[PDB]
Write an enzyme that holds these catalytic residues in place. Sequence first.
Site, mmCIF file in Angstrom:
data_model
loop_
_atom_site.group_PDB
_atom_site.id
_atom_site.type_symbol
_atom_site.label_atom_id
_atom_site.label_comp_id
_atom_site.label_asym_id
_atom_site.label_seq_id
_atom_site.Cartn_x
_atom_site.Cartn_y
_atom_site.Cartn_z
ATOM 1 N N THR A 125 15.092 6.018 -8.796
ATOM 2 C CA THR A 125 15.141 7.469 -8.531
ATOM 3 C C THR A 125 16.165 7.965 -7.684
ATOM 4 O O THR A 125 17.032 8.966 -8.216
ATOM 5 C CB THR A 125 13.874 7.731 -7.873
ATOM 6 O OG1 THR A 125 12.502 7.851 -8.413
ATOM 7 C CG2 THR A 125 13.926 9.671 -7.271
ATOM 8 N N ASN B 107 6.968 0.041 -8.813
ATOM 9 C CA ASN B 107 6.425 1.440 -9.347
ATOM 10 C C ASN B 107 6.577 1.261 -10.831
ATOM 11 O O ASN B 107 5.666 1.771 -11.589
ATOM 12 C CB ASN B 107 7.562 2.269 -8.519
ATOM 13 C CG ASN B 107 7.206 3.698 -8.953
ATOM 14 O OD1 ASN B 107 5.968 3.986 -9.433
ATOM 15 N ND2 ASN B 107 7.739 4.561 -8.478
ATOM 16 N N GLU C 151 -4.125 -16.297 7.589
ATOM 17 C CA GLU C 151 -4.405 -17.278 6.521
ATOM 18 C C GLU C 151 -3.421 -17.018 5.273
ATOM 19 O O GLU C 151 -3.047 -18.173 4.775
ATOM 20 C CB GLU C 151 -5.724 -17.422 5.934
ATOM 21 C CG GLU C 151 -6.820 -17.625 6.612
ATOM 22 C CD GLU C 151 -7.887 -18.481 6.064
ATOM 23 O OE1 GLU C 151 -7.891 -18.676 4.984
ATOM 24 O OE2 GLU C 151 -8.450 -19.395 7.010
#
EC number: 3.6.5.-
Lengths: 328, 426, 412
Positions: C152, C179, C227
């Site tokens: 963009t 995106n 984790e």
Amino acid sequence: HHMKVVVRVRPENTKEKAAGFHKVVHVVDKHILVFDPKQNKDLKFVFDAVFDETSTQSEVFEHTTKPILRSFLNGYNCTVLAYGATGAGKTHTMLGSADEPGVMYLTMLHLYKCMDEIKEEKICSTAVSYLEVYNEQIRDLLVNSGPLAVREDTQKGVVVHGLTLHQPKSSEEILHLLDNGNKNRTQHPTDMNATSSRSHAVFQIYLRQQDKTASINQNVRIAKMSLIDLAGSERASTSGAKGTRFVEGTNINRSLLALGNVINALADSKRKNQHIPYRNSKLTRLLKDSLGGNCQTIMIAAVSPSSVFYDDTYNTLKYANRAKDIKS
Amino acid sequence: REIVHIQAGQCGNQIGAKFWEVISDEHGIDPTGSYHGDSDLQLERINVYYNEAAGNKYVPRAILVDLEPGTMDSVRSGPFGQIFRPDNFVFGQSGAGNNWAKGHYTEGAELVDSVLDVVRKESESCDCLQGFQLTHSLGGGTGSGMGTLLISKIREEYPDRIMNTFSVVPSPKVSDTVVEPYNATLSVHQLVENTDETYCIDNEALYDICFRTLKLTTPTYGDLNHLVSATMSGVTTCLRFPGQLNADLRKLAVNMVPFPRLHFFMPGFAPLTSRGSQQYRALTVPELTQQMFDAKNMMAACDPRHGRYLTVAAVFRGRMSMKEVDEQMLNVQNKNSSYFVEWIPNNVKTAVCDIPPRGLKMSATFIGNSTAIQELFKRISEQFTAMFRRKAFLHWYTGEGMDEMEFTEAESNMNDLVSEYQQYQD
Amino acid sequence: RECISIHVGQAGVQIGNACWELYCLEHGIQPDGHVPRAVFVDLEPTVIDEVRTGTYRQLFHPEQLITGKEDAANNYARGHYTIGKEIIDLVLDRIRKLADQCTGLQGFSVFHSFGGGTGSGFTSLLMERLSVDYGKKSKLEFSIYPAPQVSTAVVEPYNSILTTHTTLEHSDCAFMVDNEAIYDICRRNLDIERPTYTNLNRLIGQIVSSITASLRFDGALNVDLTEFQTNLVPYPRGHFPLATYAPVISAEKAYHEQLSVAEITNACFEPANQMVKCDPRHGKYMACCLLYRGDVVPKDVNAAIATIKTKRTIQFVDWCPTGFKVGINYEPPTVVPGGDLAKVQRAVCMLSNTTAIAEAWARLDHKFDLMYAKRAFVHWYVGEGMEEGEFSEAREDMAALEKDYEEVGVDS
Ligand SMILES: CC(=O)O[C@H]1C(=O)[C@@]2(C)[C@H]([C@H](OC(=O)c3ccccc3)[C@]3(O)C[C@H](OC(=O)[C@H](O)[C@@H](NC(=O)c4ccccc4)c4ccccc4)C(C)=C1C3(C)C)[C@]1(OC(C)=O)CO[C@@H]1C[C@@H]2O
Ligand SMILES: Nc1nc2c(ncn2[C@@H]2O[C@H](COP(=O)(O)OP(=O)(O)OP(=O)(O)O)[C@@H](O)[C@H]2O)c(=O)[nH]1
Ligand SMILES: Nc1nc2c(ncn2[C@@H]2O[C@H](COP(=O)(O)OP(=O)(O)O)[C@@H](O)[C@H]2O)c(=O)[nH]1
Ligand SMILES: O=[N+]([O-])c1cc(Cl)ccc1S(=O)(=O)c1ccccc1
Ligand SMILES: [Mg+2]
Ligand SMILES: [Zn+2]
């Protein structure tokens, strides 16, 4: 080519020496310097000449300014480009160092001597000026001027009118213009109070040679010489939000960008031509007249060995070398 | 955030009446009346152009700068003319002579301090200032001389706040003035060194776009100015609405100026259909990008087909998919890879507001930074040399305290500005 | 135990509102219940104002909604240095006020949009100031990196080569969601040429629910945030796994829904389903944390993964014997009441470091050079308290990230 580059390292500072943390660059031999010693980046950099920390003002005088004087006397306009880290100390001892022999002092004497010999043999006349670029306004340092207006002559070589030059009587008369000027610029009140580092100081000397040996009616050769002290670059902190720095730093940041972009474009215009936008700054347009053409130029970068200079000297070696290294 | 408009000279003033005729309906502001707004959103952001005083009297925060009384005395005596606080009228009852020097050095130079006084009253209004809108013609005393001085002073007082300019560059085919290139070359010279966004509009590029893209047979000036004011609303006030991807004057500037000259753009509106018949509603989206990116439909004289783009800003305003927007822009970038420049991987700045222009479903303002505008500062700079060689009407400038070097300076600068714009066409 | 969140930049706040919507929706906490555990940051008021005006209005404190009324600017420098500096102290003060109130937290799930001004530049220093004030915690940044072709901002790469270099030495594990490679899921795996931004935000709203929400929740094979970075980062670069979801089926069109584990797990490693234009073109997986949720037998997983470990066309790294963190949660996914998402009774939200991002980084770095080679929009950052340094020196940074993601794979 005409461009030749020399970088003169300056000794570590008393405090920097006594601490000693990883050195920014570690100067290997005289010409080659390694960056980021162990691995790390371990970047070798070559330059055309390089001078070590042992090389003082007097050695850089003889090296740098000897091809300058000869070309300046020949009637080829010369310039010296200073550099240095943003942190003073290297640049502080590089320029205005009275105690140090001075690249500028020995080159002013070197020219001053050569000027007297050309005048005895031939009618030579000279003049000098001293200006700064603070706030992107040109100030004369000799006379208290205001913003020099721009005109263009028949050549249309862009002139800031209202400049005054006196003829060099002795080096002593020049020293009075250096003193007048050096006190005319303000210190910068941000950080520690430096000299006028953040403002660009310009020294100008104009040689004018007529030959007694040649006919009286001849072309005159003139060169212009200039020496420019530049600022260092500003970080976030050294900048700051503050409105007081604010104006000054905006002037410097666009001057550094447009100037350094014109230096990169200058190296490209050692191939190219009208490409290089002289117009991007006021002084960069006058820098076309001096640095543009096939005129003999030299850059003197400063480098400190201190770890503080890690960033600054690396960015200045990066930027100076970037314009050399790029060729298409 | 906030802006303060500036109606320099008669043309910038006449347009000011049309800019404010439009924007006020785009904000439900009746003559001295308040927000009648058909919605509630045309009010959470009005502050951009107005001030709170009464509670029904949001006054346009503009400046009306003219040496000709009869002009501001036609704008103030007509429709919306009674909205401006009288404090905004910076008149100069002097001779408004058609000389750039007469409006910049001699007769405009006195009136400036009584302008800067008010430009500060309005900038020190409240909140945070963004910038200033400027309207004028580059073809007259008060437009190009005085209006270009107002900015040379604004850009010294607030080098932080942006400066949009809406210049009426001298139209090619016929000049509506004689000295035209003199008034023009001398203002574009100030523009290239102060304002940082310019939107150049040409009275005949408008006539073409207003007589063939609207079947409108009698395009009055009110109509040209209306079309112009339709774009400058889709630029500023528009992006002072919500959007899935909004921008603002800085995003426009910081995406659209690759090099600090300022650069001058060429506005284009989206749904430009004649009234009754051509209400085709072919406005899904590919029809807006079809519109904005054609040659004709650019409010500039020069055709974009004659030169690369550096930047584009499609400032859409109307509910649409962020897929059918961001997609269309790509096929447009690839069909025309020829004219779009290559050292910018994505030239286009997609911008998307939500609310459309009051009565319409979907629009999009276009703001093109094409190198094609080279072929206009060429035009102006030619007309200059052809007459400057003979010093044509120059005694009207020097006889008003000017310099033979001042004309030289402005031509040479704006003629260098042509050269630079070609460095990227290649 | 907890994880704060810091939703920065308009897009990091739009995704923020959507991840935050899906939360209360699967926790029975309607518009006005408990209290959130996060903050919102922007240098454009009008956007954080959409959280102050629109849905979820009173679910937040006006104290966890930071705004700078001033100017966003699509430039890193301004948003990091110059402007975004003024706000940082106030921002930190919330992620130090919200970080004190809790009980023995684990970290901050940052939400930013890489190629922005407030999403690049500000977060760079926010994460900067975090790694010093809380170096003893998790710093999992959830990014929306630049679309591979459908960017963009004109400058995008300048903003995203500068968020990467400054955050790299500061993050613990950077989730990534592209995106554009989501819109391919909306077109191919859901059938809609009407994807509003509000939908991609539901989809990251979904994968993200699988990360914090359901995994901080009890299950048959719980997986703390520590984790992740342990089982997911092989090396100290703030390594950037990719997010993927499995039952991305349409809630209208097809209906096979009942797609036992053996299918939904295979639907993760097909490249057309991974919210990232980093199609496994060569990129060896090096560690994958398959988060499951819903009705899942641990043997179905310890068999549905065993089949995959022997597909070989999925080529894991050499120095990695087994790089499969199985996480099992109980509660099935929870779809939006009438969005477009299927609603299955199980899902696989796999995420993984892949040598594939050797591409994505290369294609984003090459972008930067083309403009920096001409300076392009450089005067917009230098005038904002930056230098030739921070560009050229953050370019050299990502150069050793093209080499890092090359050397950690491709070789044996
Ligand atoms: C029944 C109906 O739908 O009528 C339309 C209409 O017929 C058309 C032809 C309108 C019409 O515009 C013109 O004819 C026109 C006249 C002079 C100069 C330029 C244009 C319209 O007058 C214009 C008007 O525009 C608006 O309402 C926008 O909000 C617009 N407003 C103004 O320009 C304005 C006019 C008078 C007073 C105050 C404001 C706007 C656009 C951008 C940014 C802000 C505002 C619209 C949709 C129409 C009419 C009324 C017929 C069109 O223009 C615009 C700007 O929308 C011309 O092509 C489009 C397509 C529209 O469908
Ligand atoms: N998935 C998703 N991506 C978004 C959303 N909003 C914006 N983006 C993407 O993020 C980038 C846009 O960043 P901007 O909105 O311009 O800027 P910002 O990061 O909010 O900060 P500023 O530049 O200062 O306004 C683009 O690449 C968009 O495609 C959203 O709601 N969802
Ligand atoms: N679009 C447009 N152009 C105008 C208007 N008025 C004058 N112009 C243009 O402006 C130029 C003349 O300058 P003018 O505005 O009279 O100068 P000033 O009044 O002395 O500042 C001509 O090119 C006209 O076409 C107008 O209302 N709209
Ligand atoms: O390079 N300079 O312009 C300069 C910048 C500073 Cl900050 C200080 C001095 C000088 S000088 O003229 O070289 C000089 C050198 C020696 C004596 C006086 C002046
Ligand atoms: Mg934003
Ligand atoms: Zn079924």
